[PDB]
Write a protein that binds this DNA or RNA. Structure first.
Ligand code: MG
Ligand code: MG
Ligand code: MG
Ligand code: MG
Ligand code: MG
Ligand code: MG
Ligand code: MG
Ligand code: MG
Ligand code: MG
Ligand code: MG
Ligand code: MG
Ligand code: MG
Ligand code: MG
Ligand code: MG
Ligand code: MG
Ligand code: MG
Ligand code: MG
Ligand code: MG
Ligand code: MG
Ligand code: MG
Ligand code: MG
Ligand code: MG
Ligand code: MG
Ligand code: MG
Ligand code: MG
Ligand code: MG
Ligand code: MG
Ligand code: MG
Ligand code: MG
Ligand code: MG
Ligand code: MG
Ligand code: MG
Ligand code: MG
Ligand code: MG
Ligand code: MG
Ligand code: MG
Ligand code: MG
Ligand code: MG
Ligand code: MG
Ligand code: MG
Ligand code: MG
Ligand code: MG
Ligand code: MG
Ligand code: MG
Ligand code: MG
Ligand code: MG
Ligand code: MG
Ligand code: MG
Ligand code: MG
Ligand code: MG
Ligand code: MG
Ligand code: MG
Ligand code: MG
Ligand code: MG
Ligand code: MG
Ligand code: MG
Ligand code: MG
Ligand code: MG
Ligand code: MG
Ligand code: MG
Ligand code: MG
Lengths: 64, 145, 118, 204
RNA sequence: GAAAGUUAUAAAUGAAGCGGUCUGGAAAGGCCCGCCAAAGACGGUAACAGCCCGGUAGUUGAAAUGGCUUUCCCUCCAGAGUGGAUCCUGAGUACGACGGAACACGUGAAAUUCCGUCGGAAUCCGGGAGGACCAUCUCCCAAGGCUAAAUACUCCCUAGUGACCGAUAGUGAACCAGUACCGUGAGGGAAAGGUGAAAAGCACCCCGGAAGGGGAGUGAAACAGUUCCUGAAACCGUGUGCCUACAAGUAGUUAGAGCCCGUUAAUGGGUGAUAGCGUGCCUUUUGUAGAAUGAACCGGCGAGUUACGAUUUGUUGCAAGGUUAAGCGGAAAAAGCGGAGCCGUAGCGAAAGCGAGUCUGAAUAGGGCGCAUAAGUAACAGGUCGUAGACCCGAAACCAGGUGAUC
RNA sequence: GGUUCGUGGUAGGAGAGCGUUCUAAGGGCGGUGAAGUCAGACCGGAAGGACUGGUGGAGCGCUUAGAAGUGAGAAUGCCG
């Protein structure tokens, strides 16, 4: 049978035009009185999956 | 010549068989090491497992939604349209007639990458602002279908 | 297609028992005991090609020594004189002269004795 | 290009074959690949063995796990038992596979143009027999020097050509649209009528 | 219910070499000559047969019974338009509340279908659906029933096929096999093929109660004689060339006299008084001669495979393009047809959307991702991964249907 | 074909090969004796391959490719 796509990763990962994976920062839910404005202003941006993590999660999102 | 068949060199290789003696380097343990979870038959962990540490996908948030009414257009640039003859009435039927456009998903949109020299009369559903301007600079005429 | 293991296992095993010919008891009859006796014999023969060169030089040296002491010399003084004078004969042939042609061994011992005296 | 012969074995003029079909440079690497695929698509693959779950018996543990002094065992149909099941073995399976359609066309042209460089192709005015007669086919087959295995390609001909050559051992007759790389390569010479040459060039 | 045709269930006919010669127990084999073929499939015959036998291709054949097709007989039958007063169009039903289930959909914003219990419509000026719901529009008439083919399987019968097995294999069972045997019972469940072409299976004599032998005879062979083709290793013996009763040994290896032989003929073979060196194999370990583990010995059997997907490398074809799937066709072929679909050729954004740019932002700022700075695709082979028992053997335990108070 | 530098090795990576069963084509030997089995003082760098002789009494190699039920000394392994 054709292998299945990780549905929990397809809801929060995104493929760029060079094959890389793009994500969002993960410390922005509810404790905004404990983080400075410099932190908050930079955690609302996006980031890239590092090389170490990419090698472990290639096959989970192969078909988008 | 059925007795002198010679396949192309490098196109075929002999497979590797493990567990067939210690003179080949893949003997006793067959390339597996010594006494772990990965040395057992059917052993191994999930694709994204990290041994109890929270997986990467579970410490970043989800984002967005999917639009049901999403429109995706078939894209043709200016360079491809230069293959026509002067004065030709360029039509989406003509685009699929030649086979340059395989499927018109929701329509045809002309973008402005490249250059156009022929004076054409193109028709489609959508035009980019630069593409429409460029065609009008060569004595063209764009009418939106 | 099925490949039954015939005619190949016996040919290889019998070739080892033949090499164990002359061994005591089951070491020349049974494969497992004869297999590890053949490997050991190869290991003993490998390093005995190294000691065979050591064993003979000790025999030549202890034999040139005996003949040199009959000329009021030791082996060490004889060897120093020969190298000092320039004679380049090795131990295998100096021992040959000491047994078969003792007359010429005294000729070489005279050259060694003179070189040690200027 | 080629001298044209009659059924009686006499010269009857000359015929020119298409240079894009019978005159290309053969691609030997392509022909080998198509031959291998065409041989591998001919085998049935009807073979099977019984696992440890298909041999009758088993289930009951042969003896107590501890205390008896024997080795631990779980079934009498285990792979290492005398009547036990096979571990992996064969299984029913298909072997057929097919190359891209353009590669298959280039292999037919190459094998059919190599038979011209080797002077092993015989163009013929027309082959027909009033009644099936295996004796007459042998007499025909010696008027033209072959003396070995051959492939007879006839388009119009008749039904008497196949009947009168069926009993011969190294002779095979095909109706000019069944031509294939394996059949052409399996034989030495290639006798083809003029009408069959026209149909072959039409396809490719 | 008849007739005609076809088919299944027994069958008939059917070409061509006693060809010569050699070896041989025996010719189908070697050498030298002929012939048949719509028949050179298969099997047998004293070794390998197109021309010796049964047959094969082709052509014929059915009293009787079953099947199929057609026709006859037989049986049964109203279908068009115009009006629309008035009447009919499936009731404890559709729905709703409560509790469950099926829907890919776990009560969720939950449409749709079904079950149990309560409440409970309209009926053509009517009713339902279009994923809560309302209005418009579009499509359609629930609460009655029937329906062939395209699809799934093989205890069976006929004809065949296999880069399937060949007696520890292949069905548990090639042999009087679900038998012998084991259990109160449900139930579990084996081992065991081969004389020879032909029994021509040893008349007769001798030892012996017999068994069993030695001759004679049959046979190509009896060292093929009733587990009988071939007959390995462990294991048990008889004869003999060299050594051995003052010696401390993982049994060998290196040096070596003496004695005895004579080869795939070459700085050859067997045995060895004496001298030097030398604590088995595997596994598991920081580390094993290990007083840690496994193996009495010999033989056979016994462990990374396959299908479908992902990714990378190699090879081949075409190349801004590459390629068909199911299917039709056919010989369990090869073409041909089939462009539906898939990957690539453009990205950015949650999305509307814009587009070689786009998003964030008040910004023409800066920055992120892209283009500039373009090679993909189809098929096969190698490595690795995913779903499958997935590398082989091994639990104590859990659940479901049954059999047991002859102890 | 030369010059220089190298060539201990466990887990492990890479490469080249030997041998077994079956298939296809070419070419072969065999009752003047096939496979198997027994012995030998031969050949190759290894896995391995010939030759001669005894037994046996009917099948079997070689070359180039292809496909695997592919090679055992150990599992208190199964059977004899
Ligand atoms: Mg928030
Ligand atoms: Mg390899
Ligand atoms: Mg190694
Ligand atoms: Mg091992
Ligand atoms: Mg281990
Ligand atoms: Mg490990
Ligand atoms: Mg076999
Ligand atoms: Mg074996
Ligand atoms: Mg000895
Ligand atoms: Mg079972
Ligand atoms: Mg059970
Ligand atoms: Mg079995
Ligand atoms: Mg007859
Ligand atoms: Mg006849
Ligand atoms: Mg004779
Ligand atoms: Mg004859
Ligand atoms: Mg035959
Ligand atoms: Mg015979
Ligand atoms: Mg026979
Ligand atoms: Mg409810
Ligand atoms: Mg209800
Ligand atoms: Mg309504
Ligand atoms: Mg809908
Ligand atoms: Mg709606
Ligand atoms: Mg119904
Ligand atoms: Mg059996
Ligand atoms: Mg047998
Ligand atoms: Mg009983
Ligand atoms: Mg008798
Ligand atoms: Mg008697
Ligand atoms: Mg007798
Ligand atoms: Mg006789
Ligand atoms: Mg026989
Ligand atoms: Mg016997
Ligand atoms: Mg014996
Ligand atoms: Mg003493
Ligand atoms: Mg003594
Ligand atoms: Mg001591
Ligand atoms: Mg000693
Ligand atoms: Mg010792
Ligand atoms: Mg162990
Ligand atoms: Mg320890
Ligand atoms: Mg232990
Ligand atoms: Mg023990
Ligand atoms: Mg043992
Ligand atoms: Mg694996
Ligand atoms: Mg390519
Ligand atoms: Mg069909
Ligand atoms: Mg077919
Ligand atoms: Mg997107
Ligand atoms: Mg920018
Ligand atoms: Mg904004
Ligand atoms: Mg009871
Ligand atoms: Mg090394
Ligand atoms: Mg070194
Ligand atoms: Mg490797
Ligand atoms: Mg064989
Ligand atoms: Mg022999
Ligand atoms: Mg095996
Ligand atoms: Mg081993
Ligand atoms: Mg054993």
């Amino acid at each position: 049978p054709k292998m299945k796509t990780h549905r929990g990763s397809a809801k929060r990962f995104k493929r760029t035009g060079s094959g890389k994976l793009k994500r969002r920062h993960g410390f922005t839910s509810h404790m905004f009185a404990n983080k400075s404005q410099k932190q908050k202003r930079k955690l609302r941006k996006s980031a890239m999956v590092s090389a170490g993590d990419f090698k472990r999660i290639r096959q989970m999102v192969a078909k988008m | 010549k059925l007795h002198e068949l010679k396949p192309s060199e490098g196109s075929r290789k002999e497979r590797n068989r493990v567990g067939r003696g210690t003179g080949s380097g893949n003997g006793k343990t067959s390339g597996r090491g010594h006494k772990g979870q990965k040395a057992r038959s059917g052993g191994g962990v999930r694709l994204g497992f990290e041994g109890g540490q929270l997986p990467l996908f579970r410490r970043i948030p989800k984002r967005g939604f999917t639009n049901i009414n999403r429109k995706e257009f078939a894209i043709v640039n200016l360079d491809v349209l230069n293959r026509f003859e002067d004065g030709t009435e360029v039509t989406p039927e003509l685009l699929i007639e030649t086979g340059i456009i395989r499927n018109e998903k929701s329509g045809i949109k002309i973008l402005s990458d490249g250059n156009i020299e022929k004076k054409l009369t193109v028709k489609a559903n959508k035009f980019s602002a630069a593409a429409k301007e460029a065609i009008e600079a060569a004595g063209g005429k764009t009418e939106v279908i | 297609p099925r490949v039954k293991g015939g005619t190949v296992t016996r040919k290889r095993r019998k070739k080892i028992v033949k090499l164990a010919k002359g061994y005591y008891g089951s070491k020349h009859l049974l494969f497992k005991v004869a297999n590890q006796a053949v490997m050991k014999s190869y290991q003993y023969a490998y390093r005995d090609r190294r000691q065979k060169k050591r064993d003979f030089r000790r025999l030549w040296i202890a034999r040139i020594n005996a003949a040199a002491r009959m000329q009021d010399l030791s082996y060490s003084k004889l060897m120093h004189g020969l190298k000092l004078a320039g004679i380049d004969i090795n131990r295998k042939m100096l021992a040959d002269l000491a047994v078969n042609d003792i007359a010429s061994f005294n000729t070489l011992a005279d050259s060694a004795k003179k070189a040690l005296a200027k | 290009k080629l001298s044209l012969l009659k059924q009686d074995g006499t010269n009857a003029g000359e015929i020119t074959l298409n240079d894009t079909v019978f005159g290309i440079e053969p691609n030997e690497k392509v022909v080998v690949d198509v031959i291998l695929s065409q041989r591998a698509s001919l085998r049935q693959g009807t073979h099977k063995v019984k696992n440890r779950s298909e041999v009758r018996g088993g289930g009951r543990k042969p003896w107590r796990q501890k205390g008896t002094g024997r080795a631990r065992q779980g079934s009498i149909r285990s792979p290492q038992w005398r009547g036990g099941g096979v571990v992996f073995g064969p299984t029913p399976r298909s072997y057929a596979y097919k190359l891209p359609k353009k590669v298959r066309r280039l292999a037919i042209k190459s094998i059919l143009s190599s038979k011209v460089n080797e002077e092993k192709l015989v163009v013929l005015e027309g082959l027909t027999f009033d009644a099936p007669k295996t004796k007459e086919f042998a007499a025909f087959l010696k008027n033209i020097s072959v003396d070995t295995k051959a492939l007879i390609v006839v388009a119009g001909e008749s039904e008497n050509v196949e009947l009168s050559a069926r009993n011969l051992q190294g002779i095979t007759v095909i109706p000019a649209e069944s031509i294939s790389v394996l059949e052409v390569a399996k034989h030495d010479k290639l006798i083809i009528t003029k009408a069959a040459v026209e149909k072959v060039e039409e396809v490719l």
